[PDB]
Amino acid sequence: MHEKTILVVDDEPRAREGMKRLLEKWASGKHRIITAANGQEALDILRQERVHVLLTDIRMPEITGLDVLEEMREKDDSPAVILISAYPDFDYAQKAISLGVLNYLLKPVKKSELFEAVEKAIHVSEQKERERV
Numbered sequence: 001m002h003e004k005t006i007l008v009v010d011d012e013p014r015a016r017e018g019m020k021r022l023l024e025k026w027a028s029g030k031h032r033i034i035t036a037a038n039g040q041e042a043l044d045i046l047r048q049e050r051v052h053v054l055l056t057d058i059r060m061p062e063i064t065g066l067d068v069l070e071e072m073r074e075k076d077d078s079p080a081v082i083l084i085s086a087y088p089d090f091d092y093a094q095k096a097i098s099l100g101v102l103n104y105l106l107k108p109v110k111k112s113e114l115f116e117a118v119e120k121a122i123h124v125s126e127q128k129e130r131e132r133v
């Protein structure tokens with residue numbers, strides 16, 4: 001009951017683990033924070049386990065965060081997606097819009113905006129868990 005799995009993907013170790021640490025005290029043990037170091041690790045985790053919220057960097061070698069998304073729009077319980085990037089890139093944002101991202105946060109993320117996005121994402125997750133009837 002109640003406990004959601006949040007996957008944070010970033011190819012920079014300090015950004016990845018820092019964000020993990022931020023979310024881990026924001027969750028206060030109520031949720032499960034996990035991390036991946038790149039797009040292939042994230043895809044591996046996404047295919048083997050329920051992820052409710054996906055928080056991912058966009059620019060990663062070989063497989064971008066947008067690439068990851070296009071593999072999940074092709075699946076059943078696709079997670080709610082927050083993208084993150086150091087780049088205010090309109091092309092990424094436009095593609096992200098077209099793929100249904102919930103938030104595009106810029107680095108470094110203000111923990112105010114980051115907590116806000118995850119809460120909306122956790123909420124959006126419950127909304128489509130109830131459409132099994």
Ligand SMILES: [Mg+2]
Pocket residue numbers: 010011012057058059060
């Ligand atoms: Mg990166």
